[PDB]
């Protein structure tokens, strides 16, 4: 096929849904080394990378995105921008695109959600899983109490089966 | 009213990563070291260089910091030194892939 | 070795004075404020601009430091903010006479 | 050229920390010092000497200057102060490479020592009385140079 299944994905995510230090322990290898050295601080694309590597849709070794390797010798994309581009290059057209996104807009659907917007100086946005009610971490949709200065402008969703 | 990171050149993004990280190494505050490494990670996100380059660059930083730069006054001039390390001959080959 | 201050551009010399000073304003160490200030002094000696410019630029630094710079980490990103301030619209007109 | 005895005595009045020199001169010089913009008092002290001995820095010098409470002008860049000495007194009396005190034995006046190693100054400007300096000379073999290595010393003798 082409995309992982939702329950698998949600579980793998549960495995990496911890601090970035933990994510580093877990994956180890160069991912770990870069996390320990303080080079990677945002673990969001690492987790999404892990989810794809753990559900039988591995990031290819020759994929045109910046990646480093883990203990498992699999590959982890470490930039949010590269992670987001990777989703569209590797899964095709999304099923949903929404300007000024809030939870109600994604109701009754499920899978990988991307929220882009301004206010984070280190991240164009956020990539996470959405189960039709909540995200596997934080959605950062309109009014999320963890947004801070982040104003979400577009949300896009690829449905997972 | 501040410029976005993306409006710097790639060379400038890498130089700023070096300058920021260097400031992290000379800070004594836990607070300032954390601020420094979060700041550097923004630059890293914006750069198109592979992570290896940044690791090498950290090595070069550690070496060039043991250089003494002085002036007509007491002081360590570490902040200046960081700005100089960022624009150094040693760092320059790491701006390319 | 390290590059001399004189091998930079007058614009860059000014930007670096601003950044160095700004680090000074954001430090909580007193020896880091002293370091920042000695460093900044070194950039002022090489600059060809009038003192008055540096005074106005200090004003702009104080103003722009109030601005909030956020990210995915909880800190205030002051180190990044200093580099941004040195390259801001508000500082540019002071690069000339 | 100002008389040596006066130069020397005048210099003693500003031979203190920068903060002090600022309190003393006041005005925009003190404003910039209070601000921490000026950290090197060398050219300001030399300005003070010149101003206090009847050879004051002209308002329209082609060198960066700023006023004190006395409404006299003070140059805040060592590079400018140095160029100023040649612009105003003309040729020097002595120029010596690798400058040592022995090279200036038996002559009094204004001494400039250029060299590398200090990031904020191409050299030092001070008074020399035939054996000792107003503050530190920074000649070769001097113990308080640090990173500074003097490459040439130039003397304008004062009457």
Residue numbers in the entry:
A (entry chain A): 1 to 161
B (entry chain I), C (entry chain P): 20 to 116
D (entry chain H): 3 to 161
Authors' account:
The type VI secretion system (T6SS) is a novel multi-subunit needle-like apparatus and plays an important role in many processes of bacterial life cycles, such as interspecies competition, biofilm formation and virulence-related processes. Meanwhile, to protect itself from accidental injury, the cognate immunity proteins were produced to protect the donor cells against the toxic effectors. Tae4 (type VI amidase effector 4) and Tai4 (type VI amidase immunity 4) are T6SS effector-immunity pairs from the fourth family. To this end, we determined the high-resolution crystal structure of the effector StTae4 from S. typhimurium in complex with the immunity protein EcTai4 from E. cloacae and studied the cross-neutralization of EcTai4 toward various effectors from the four families by in vitro and in vivo interactions.
The complex belonged to the P212121 space group while the Ec- and StTae4-Tai4 belonged to the C121 and P6122 space group, respectively. The results indicate that the active complex is a heterotetramer in solution, consisting of a Tai4 homodimer [named subunit I (cyan) and subunit II (orange)] binding two Tae4 molecules, consistent with the status of the Ec- and StTae4-Tai4 complexes in solution. The four heterotetramers in the asymmetric unit are likely the result of crystal packing, and represent no significant biological relevance. Clip I, composed of the residues from Gly132 to Leu142, adopts similar structure to that in the former StTae4, but a remarkable shift (∼5.4 Å) in the terminus occurs. It is worth to note that the conserved residues Cys135 and Cys139 form a disulfide bond (DSB) to stabilize the flexible loop, while there is no DSB between the two residues in the loop of the former one, where the two sulfydryl groups are in opposite directions. Moreover, the overall conformation of the Clip II in the present structure is different from that in the former one from StTae4-Tai4, which may be adaptive to the binding and inhibition of EcTai4. However, the dominant feature of the protruding loop in Tai4 is a shift by ∼3.0 Å compared with the former EcTae4, which may be adaptive for inserting into the active site of different effectors within this family. It is worth to note that the conserved residues Cys41 and Cys101, located in α2 and α5 respectively, form a DSB to stabilize the super helical conformation during the inhibition process, where there is no DSB formed between the two residues in the former EcTai4. The total buried surface area in the interface of EcTai4 dimer with one StTae4 monomer is 895 Å2, with 641 Å2 contributed by two helices (α3 and α5) from StTae4 with two helices (α3 and α4) from EcTai4 subunit I, and 254 Å2 contributed by the lid loop from StTae4 interacting with the protruding loop from the neighboring EcTai4 subunit II.
